[PDB]
Amino acid sequence: RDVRREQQEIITRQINTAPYVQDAMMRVVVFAQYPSGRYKAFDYVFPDYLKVFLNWRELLEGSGRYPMGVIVSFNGNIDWTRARVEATNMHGLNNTDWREARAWGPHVICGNQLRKAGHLSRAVYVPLDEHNTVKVLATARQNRFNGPQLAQTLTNNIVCPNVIEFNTESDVIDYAKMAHIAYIDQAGLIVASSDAYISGDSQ
Amino acid sequence: RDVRREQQEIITRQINTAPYVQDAMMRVVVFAQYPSGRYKAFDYVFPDYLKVFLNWRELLEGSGRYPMGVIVSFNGNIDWTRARVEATNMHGLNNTDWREARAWGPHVICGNQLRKAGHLSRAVYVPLDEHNTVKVLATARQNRFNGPQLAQTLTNNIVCPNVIEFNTESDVIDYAKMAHIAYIDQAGLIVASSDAYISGDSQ
Amino acid sequence: RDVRREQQEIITRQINTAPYVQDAMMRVVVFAQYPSGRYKAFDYVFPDYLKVFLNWRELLEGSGRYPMGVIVSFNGNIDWTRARVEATNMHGLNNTDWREARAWGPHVICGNQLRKAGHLSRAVYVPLDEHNTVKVLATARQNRFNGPQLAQTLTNNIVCPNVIEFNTESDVIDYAKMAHIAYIDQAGLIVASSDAYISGDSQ
Numbered sequence: 001r002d003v004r005r006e007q008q009e010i011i012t013r014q015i016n017t018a019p020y021v022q023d024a025m026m027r028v029v030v031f032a033q034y035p036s037g038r039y040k041a042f043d044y045v046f047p048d049y050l051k052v053f054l055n056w057r058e059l060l061e062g063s064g065r066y067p068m069g070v071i072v073s074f075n076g077n078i079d080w081t082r083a084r085v086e087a088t089n090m091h092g093l094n095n096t097d098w099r100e101a102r103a104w105g106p107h108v109i110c111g112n113q114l115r116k117a118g119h120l121s122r123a124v125y126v127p128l129d130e131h132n133t134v135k136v137l138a139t140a141r142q143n144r145f146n147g148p149q150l151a152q153t154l155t156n157n158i159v160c161p162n163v164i165e166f167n168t169e170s171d172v173i174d175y176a177k178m179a180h181i182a183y184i185d186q187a188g189l190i191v192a193s194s195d196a197y198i199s200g201d202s203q
Numbered sequence: 204r205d206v207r208r209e210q211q212e213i214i215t216r217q218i219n220t221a222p223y224v225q226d227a228m229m230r231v232v233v234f235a236q237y238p239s240g241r242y243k244a245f246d247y248v249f250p251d252y253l254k255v256f257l258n259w260r261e262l263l264e265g266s267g268r269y270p271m272g273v274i275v276s277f278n279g280n281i282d283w284t285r286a287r288v289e290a291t292n293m294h295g296l297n298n299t300d301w302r303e304a305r306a307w308g309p310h311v312i313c314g315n316q317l318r319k320a321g322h323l324s325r326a327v328y329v330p331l332d333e334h335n336t337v338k339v340l341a342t343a344r345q346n347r348f349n350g351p352q353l354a355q356t357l358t359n360n361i362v363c364p365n366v367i368e369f370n371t372e373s374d375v376i377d378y379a380k381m382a383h384i385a386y387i388d389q390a391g392l393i394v395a396s397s398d399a400y401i402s403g404d405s406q
Numbered sequence: 407r408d409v410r411r412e413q414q415e416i417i418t419r420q421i422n423t424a425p426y427v428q429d430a431m432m433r434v435v436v437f438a439q440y441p442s443g444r445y446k447a448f449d450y451v452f453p454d455y456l457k458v459f460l461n462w463r464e465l466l467e468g469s470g471r472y473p474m475g476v477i478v479s480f481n482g483n484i485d486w487t488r489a490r491v492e493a494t495n496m497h498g499l500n501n502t503d504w505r506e507a508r509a510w511g512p513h514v515i516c517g518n519q520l521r522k523a524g525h526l527s528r529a530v531y532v533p534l535d536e537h538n539t540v541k542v543l544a545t546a547r548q549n550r551f552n553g554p555q556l557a558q559t560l561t562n563n564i565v566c567p568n569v570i571e572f573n574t575e576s577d578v579i580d581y582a583k584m585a586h587i588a589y590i591d592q593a594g595l596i597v598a599s600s601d602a603y604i605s606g607d608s609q
Contacts, residue, residue, distance in 0.1 A: 018303045025296065025304040045295050047306035051564045075301075092451050092566025093431065098481075099526075099586055099600060100424045101431040103453035103562050120302075135564055145557035151348035154357065154560065156306050158254045158338055160295025180302055194302060221506045228499065228507040248498050250509035278504075323505075354551035357560065359509050361457045361541055363498025383505055397505060 008198060015196040019076045019120055020141075023047055023156070026076030027194075028138050029181055031172060032059060032067040039166040040067075041175070048144060048157040052136040056090050059134065062165070069127040070134060073182045075120055075194045079141040085109040085124060090131040104137075117182035118195035125184055211401060218399040222279045222323055223344075226250055226359070229279030230397075231341050232384055234375060235262060235270040242369040243270075244378070251347060251360040255339040259293050262337065265368070272330040273337060276385045278323055278397045282344040288312040288327060293334040307340075320385035321398035328387055414604060421602040425482045425526055426547075429453055429562070432482030433600075434544050435587055437578060438465060438473040445572040446473075447581070454550060454563040458542040462496050465540065468571070475533040476540060479588045481526055481600045485547040491515040491530060496537040510543075523588035524601035531590055 018024060028050050030042040038061060044050050059067055072085050086108045088094050094105035114122035128134070139145075144153045166172045169186055176183035176192035183192040221227060231253050233245040241264060247253050262270055275288050289311045291297050297308035317325035331337070342348075347356045369375045372389055379386035379395035386395040424430060434456050436448040444467060450456050465473055478491050492514045494500050500511035520528035534540070545551075550559045572578045575592055582589035582598035589598040 015300070015302050021305070023306045025301050025306070027301050043294065045301060045304070049561050051561065053564050053566045055566075055568060088566070091449065091568055092564075097421070097586065098431050098433050098451060099421050099602070101451070102427070103429045103431070103564070133566070135566075137561065137564070139561055143557075145561070146554070148349070150557060150560075151346075151353060154353075155252050155254065155340065155342055155348070158256050158295075158306070158340070160256045160258075160291070160336070160338075162258060162294055180300065196302070218503070218505050224508070226509045228504050228509070230504050246497065248504060248507070351552070354549075354556060357556075358455050358457065358543065358545055358551070361459050361498075361509070361543070363459045363461075363494070363539070363541075365461060365497055383503065399505070 012196050012198045016120065019194070022144065024077060026050070026078055026138060026140065027073075027179075027181055028052070028075065028136060029073040029176075030054065030134060030136065031071040031073065031183065033069055033071070034061045034065050034067050036061065036063065036065065037168060039169065039172045041162075041164040041166065041172070043162045043164060043179075044159055046157060046159040047140070048153045049139045050136065050159055052134070053092055054134040055092070056131050056133055059128075059132075066130050067128055069125060071184050072124050072126060072136060073117075073176070074114065074122040074138055075181045077141045078122075079139045080114065080122065082137065082139055083110065083114060083122065084137050085126060086135050087126055087128055087132045088135055090133060092133050092135065115184065115190070117184075117190045118193040120194035121182035123182040123184050123190065215399050215401045219323065222397070225347065227280060229253070229281055229341060229343065230276075230382075230384055231255070231278065231339060232276040232379075233257065233337060233339065234274040234276065234386065236272055236274070237264045237268050237270050239264065239266065239268065240371060242372065242375045244365075244367040244369065244375070246365045246367060246382075247362055249360060249362040250343070251356045252342045253339065253362055255337070256295055257337040258295070259334050259336055262331075262335075269333050270331055272328060274387050275327050275329060275339060276320075276379070277317065277325040277341055278384045280344045281325075282342045283317065283325065285340065285342055286313065286317060286325065287340050288329060289338050290329055290331055290335045291338055293336060295336050295338065318387065318393070320387075320393045321396040323397035324385035326385040326387050326393065418602050418604045422526065425600070428550065430483060432456070432484055432544060432546065433479075433585075433587055434458070434481065434542060435479040435582075436460065436540060436542065437477040437479065437589065439475055439477070440467045440471050440473050442467065442469065442471065443574060445575065445578045447568075447570040447572065447578070449568045449570060449585075450565055452563060452565040453546070454559045455545045456542065456565055458540070459498055460540040461498070462537050462539055465534075465538075472536050473534055475531060477590050478530050478532060478542060479523075479582070480520065480528040480544055481587045483547045484528075485545045486520065486528065488543065488545055489516065489520060489528065490543050491532060492541050493532055493534055493538045494541055496539060498539050498541065521590065521596070523590075523596045524599040526600035527588035529588040529590050529596065
């Protein structure tokens with residue numbers, strides 16, 4: 001009877017389900033917070049996998065200040081059992097002595113450290129101190145990494161980075177809402193999500 | 204009898220055939236055209252595959268102007284059935300809503316949209332508007348992407364980018380001729396090619 | 407009896423052996439030497455493989471001078487049979503004519519051209535002239551590149567680059583000693599190494 005409603009329901013479902021298709025895009029954003037109240041975002045869209053290393057100079061604010069921390073926003077059909085973040089030293093090392101450092105540290109940020117912001121999204125806050133660097137790994141949920149599919153995955157995976165400067169958190173927040181990505185505001189509230197709702201937050 | 208001629212013929216053939224050897228170099232160039240009449244070239248040489256994303260700030264002219272469009276020049280033993288280009292939005296997305304965007308769009312630039320500039324070369328003009336971004340994919344013609352060869356291909360593939368600024372199209376044109384790469388001049392003529400001719404354009 | 411000594415011996419061994427674990431970090435550094443007496447270092451840490459192309463503008467000193475040459479320092483569980491360096495032209499080509507250029511040149515720098523600086527380290531000096539570019543390849547000693555392991559290797563390999571400016575060679579030298587990496591001083595002496603010694607250079 002109410003096919004107008006049914007169609008809108010299917011559209012909502014479609015939006016929530018499209019990211020699970022094999023060549024769907026994923027979106028990871030690293031929001032850097034500065035004492036000034038300003039933010040800088042490193043926004044990555046990618047279809048298969050993302051490996052990020054933000055060096056200490058990239059993390060600096062225009063004024064030259066280092067960030068208090070980052071909000072790392074994971075969005076899409078990401079394998080949550082392998083999604084991870086760690087704050088390394090100025091050299092990108094998780095042990096001061098490189099001879100005993102590894103690809104990832106024994107206390108890498110993962111598991112339930114990533115907060116649920118919807119079925120499509122996780123977010124985590126990571127405090128930083130001076131000269132810290134940031135590493136992020138996100139991979140598509142399995143396999144495109146097996147045997148013959150690995151070839152297409154390698155050549156198909158074009159990571160598209162953007163760096164965005166925000167004057168205030170309000171700008172970050174509205175950016176996140178309109179980009180449909182998880183964000184955690186300064187009070188710790190989840191104020192943006194990838195999940196589409198047919199009536200918004202009506203309940 | 205005329206072995207001097209035969210040898211020159213073999214040299215011509217060798218030049219035209221060398222790019223088809225498995226570890227041969229390929230060359231893709233993105234020529235950005237600005238209203239000023241100036242051009243900027245993103246010149247990539249690579250042995251196996253190339254994935255390019257040019258962000259909106261990279262595409263800007265020194266003055267700060269955005270390009271009218273790009274000429275994408277494909278050269279070498281490229282798989283023409285998979286070679287492609289697309290103009291994405293400022294975020295590198297082919298759908299404004301990332302949740303319904305994909306690795307490549309439903310109308311990606313490919314097939315006979317790429318103009319033949321010789322057996323070794325294709326070229327295509329792509330008009331751009333403000334904040335557009337550019338994505339290019341080029342892969343070596345099959346397999347180096349199969350099973351055990353994929354390992355060497357991954358580690359062997361060092362993409363060597365150069366960014367070159369030109370004052371006038373004449374500079375672009377002579378650059379393309381001497382670099383043996385396809386280029387399409389402002390009148391739409393193919394004025395450069397990778398194909399070697401023993402007597403030049405003598406017919 | 408002397409378990410204090412034994413433990414220190416095991417610690418020394420552990421430091422020397424840790425880099426051979428499958429997810430251990432490797433470290434490659436390209437030290438650029440300028441006529442000014444200043445140096446610039448491109449310092450890479452990575453777990454699986456490293457592909458480097460330093461373009462001519464990256465190689466320039468702040469003043470705008472080109473380097474006299476580079477010291478390439480290889481450290482870790484590197485496959486010394488495949489480790490290599492070459493100085494290409496401004497375009498990253500090992501043949502002026504790209505149609506006859508290849509992934510690596512017929513006289514690529516490898517084998518015993520790399521000087522032994524310990525069981526963990528090799529180093530080589532490479533003179534450069536204006537507009538030369540530099541290519542480096544280093545891979546973990548086998549296999550993580552075979553079949554099903556290639557997937558993890560691809561996603562696990564986050565290369566962490568740092569660019570460091572030094573005022574004098576003395577600064578470079580002490581940097582190399584404290585970073586436990588091979589370096590060859592201006593007299594040609596090996597003055598730094600990754601190898602840990604329980605009593606230092608006491609013999």
